[PDB]
Amino acid sequence: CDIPQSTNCGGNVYSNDDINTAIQGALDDVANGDRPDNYPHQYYDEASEDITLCCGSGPWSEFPLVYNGPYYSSRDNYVSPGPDRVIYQTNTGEFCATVTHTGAASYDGFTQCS
Numbered sequence: 479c480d481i482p483q484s485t486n487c488g489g490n491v492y493s494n495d496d497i498n499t500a501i502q503g504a505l506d507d508v509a510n511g512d513r514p515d516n517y518p519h520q521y522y523d524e525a526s527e528d529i530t531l532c533c534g535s536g537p538w539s540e541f542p543l544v545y546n547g548p549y550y551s552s553r554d555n556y557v558s559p560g561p562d563r564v565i566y567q568t569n570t571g572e573f574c575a576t577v578t579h580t581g582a583a584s585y586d587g588f589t590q591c592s
Protein backbone atom coordinates (compact mmCIF):
# COMPACT_ATOMS: atom_id res chain seq x y z
CA CYS A 479 0.00 0.00 0.00
CA ASP A 480 1.05 3.70 -0.12
CA ILE A 481 4.18 4.52 1.81
CA PRO A 482 3.08 6.74 4.72
CA GLN A 483 4.36 10.28 5.25
CA SER A 484 5.74 9.17 8.62
CA THR A 485 5.91 6.32 11.09
CA ASN A 486 6.82 6.21 14.79
CA CYS A 487 8.82 3.05 15.49
CA GLY A 488 9.27 2.72 19.22
CA GLY A 489 10.05 6.45 19.46
CA ASN A 490 12.12 6.79 16.26
CA VAL A 491 10.19 8.79 13.72
CA TYR A 492 10.93 8.05 10.06
CA SER A 493 9.71 9.65 6.82
CA ASN A 494 8.38 8.28 3.58
CA ASP A 495 11.83 8.99 2.18
CA ASP A 496 13.45 6.81 4.85
CA ILE A 497 10.98 3.96 4.13
CA ASN A 498 11.40 4.14 0.34
CA THR A 499 15.17 4.37 0.73
CA ALA A 500 15.19 1.17 2.79
CA ILE A 501 13.21 -0.84 0.21
CA GLN A 502 15.27 0.59 -2.69
CA GLY A 503 18.44 -0.39 -0.81
CA ALA A 504 17.11 -3.89 -0.16
CA LEU A 505 16.28 -4.37 -3.84
CA ASP A 506 19.67 -2.98 -4.89
CA ASP A 507 21.20 -5.47 -2.42
CA VAL A 508 23.56 -3.03 -0.73
CA ALA A 509 24.12 -5.24 2.36
CA ASN A 510 27.05 -7.44 1.39
CA GLY A 511 29.20 -7.73 4.46
CA ASP A 512 30.21 -11.07 5.81
CA ARG A 513 27.28 -11.58 8.25
CA PRO A 514 26.27 -15.06 7.20
CA ASP A 515 22.71 -13.66 7.18
CA ASN A 516 23.07 -10.29 5.47
CA TYR A 517 19.98 -8.20 5.07
CA PRO A 518 17.33 -8.38 3.73
CA HIS A 519 15.94 -11.18 5.85
CA GLN A 520 12.71 -13.11 5.33
CA TYR A 521 9.76 -11.81 7.33
CA TYR A 522 7.11 -14.30 8.51
CA ASP A 523 3.78 -13.64 10.08
CA GLU A 524 3.72 -14.52 13.77
CA ALA A 525 0.11 -13.95 14.85
CA SER A 526 0.98 -13.25 18.47
CA GLU A 527 2.90 -10.12 17.40
CA ASP A 528 -0.34 -8.47 16.23
CA ILE A 529 1.15 -7.06 13.02
CA THR A 530 -1.08 -6.21 10.05
CA LEU A 531 0.46 -5.87 6.59
CA CYS A 532 -1.07 -3.75 3.82
CA CYS A 533 0.49 -5.48 0.88
CA GLY A 534 -0.85 -8.70 -0.45
CA SER A 535 0.44 -12.22 -0.04
CA GLY A 536 3.94 -13.23 0.80
CA PRO A 537 6.71 -13.97 0.42
CA TRP A 538 7.75 -10.99 2.51
CA SER A 539 11.18 -9.56 3.36
CA GLU A 540 12.45 -7.03 5.85
CA PHE A 541 15.36 -4.60 5.83
CA PRO A 542 16.72 -2.10 8.36
CA LEU A 543 14.97 1.26 8.57
CA VAL A 544 17.62 3.87 9.37
CA TYR A 545 18.21 7.58 8.95
CA ASN A 546 20.26 8.83 6.02
CA GLY A 547 19.97 5.44 4.40
CA PRO A 548 20.05 2.97 2.99
CA TYR A 549 21.48 0.67 5.58
CA TYR A 550 24.44 -1.01 3.89
CA SER A 551 27.38 -3.26 4.65
CA SER A 552 30.58 -4.37 3.01
CA ARG A 553 33.59 -6.42 4.11
CA ASP A 554 34.73 -5.13 7.52
CA ASN A 555 32.14 -2.29 7.38
CA TYR A 556 28.65 -2.20 8.81
CA VAL A 557 25.99 0.45 9.39
CA SER A 558 24.20 -0.44 12.62
CA PRO A 559 20.83 -2.16 11.74
CA GLY A 560 19.16 -0.87 14.88
CA PRO A 561 15.71 -2.04 15.95
CA ASP A 562 13.48 -0.72 13.12
CA ARG A 563 12.47 -2.38 9.85
CA VAL A 564 10.52 -2.02 6.64
CA ILE A 565 8.56 -5.05 5.44
CA TYR A 566 8.00 -5.38 1.71
CA GLN A 567 6.72 -8.04 -0.71
CA THR A 568 9.85 -9.85 -1.92
CA ASN A 569 8.75 -10.32 -5.55
CA THR A 570 7.79 -6.68 -6.14
CA GLY A 571 9.11 -4.27 -3.49
CA GLU A 572 5.59 -3.19 -2.58
CA PHE A 573 5.43 -1.69 0.89
CA CYS A 574 3.77 -3.79 3.62
CA ALA A 575 4.50 -2.21 7.02
CA THR A 576 7.02 -0.75 9.37
CA VAL A 577 7.86 -2.80 12.46
CA THR A 578 10.31 -2.62 15.33
CA HIS A 579 12.02 -4.74 17.95
CA THR A 580 11.54 -1.83 20.39
CA GLY A 581 8.77 -2.56 22.87
CA ALA A 582 8.07 -6.02 21.42
CA ALA A 583 6.15 -8.62 23.44
CA SER A 584 8.99 -11.18 23.66
CA TYR A 585 12.71 -11.63 22.89
CA ASP A 586 13.48 -11.03 19.19
CA GLY A 587 9.86 -10.14 18.56
CA PHE A 588 8.51 -7.41 16.33
CA THR A 589 5.68 -5.02 17.07
CA GLN A 590 4.01 -2.70 14.57
CA CYS A 591 5.13 0.94 14.27
CA SER A 592 2.42 3.64 14.12
Ligand SMILES: Nc1ncnc2c1ncn2[C@@H]1O[C@H](CO)[C@@H](OP(=O)(O)O)[C@H]1O
Binds near residue numbers: 519520540586
Ligand atom coordinates in the same frame (compact mmCIF):
# COMPACT_ATOMS: atom_id res chain seq x y z
N1 LIG B 1 7.72 -12.01 12.62
C1 LIG B 1 8.98 -12.04 12.98
N2 LIG B 1 9.35 -11.62 14.21
C2 LIG B 1 10.62 -11.56 14.64
N3 LIG B 1 11.68 -11.94 13.94
C3 LIG B 1 11.39 -12.41 12.70
C4 LIG B 1 10.06 -12.46 12.14
N4 LIG B 1 10.10 -13.00 10.90
C5 LIG B 1 11.37 -13.24 10.68
N5 LIG B 1 12.17 -12.91 11.74
C6 LIG B 1 13.64 -13.17 11.74
O1 LIG B 1 14.04 -13.45 13.09
C7 LIG B 1 15.07 -12.53 13.46
C8 LIG B 1 14.85 -12.18 14.90
O2 LIG B 1 15.20 -13.18 15.83
C9 LIG B 1 14.92 -11.37 12.48
O3 LIG B 1 16.16 -10.72 12.27
P1 LIG B 1 16.36 -9.18 12.39
O4 LIG B 1 15.97 -9.14 13.96
O5 LIG B 1 15.45 -8.26 11.78
O6 LIG B 1 17.82 -8.93 12.34
C10 LIG B 1 14.47 -12.05 11.20
O7 LIG B 1 15.61 -12.61 10.54
Ligand SMILES: [Ca+2]
Binds near residue numbers: 507508509510517
Ligand atom coordinates in the same frame (compact mmCIF):
# COMPACT_ATOMS: atom_id res chain seq x y z
CA1 LIG C 1 22.62 -9.00 0.96
Ligand SMILES: [Ca+2]
Binds near residue numbers: 525
Ligand atom coordinates in the same frame (compact mmCIF):
# COMPACT_ATOMS: atom_id res chain seq x y z
CA1 LIG D 1 -0.49 -10.64 11.44
Ligand SMILES: [Cl-]
Binds near residue numbers: 516517
Ligand atom coordinates in the same frame (compact mmCIF):
# COMPACT_ATOMS: atom_id res chain seq x y z
CL1 LIG E 1 24.29 -7.00 6.63
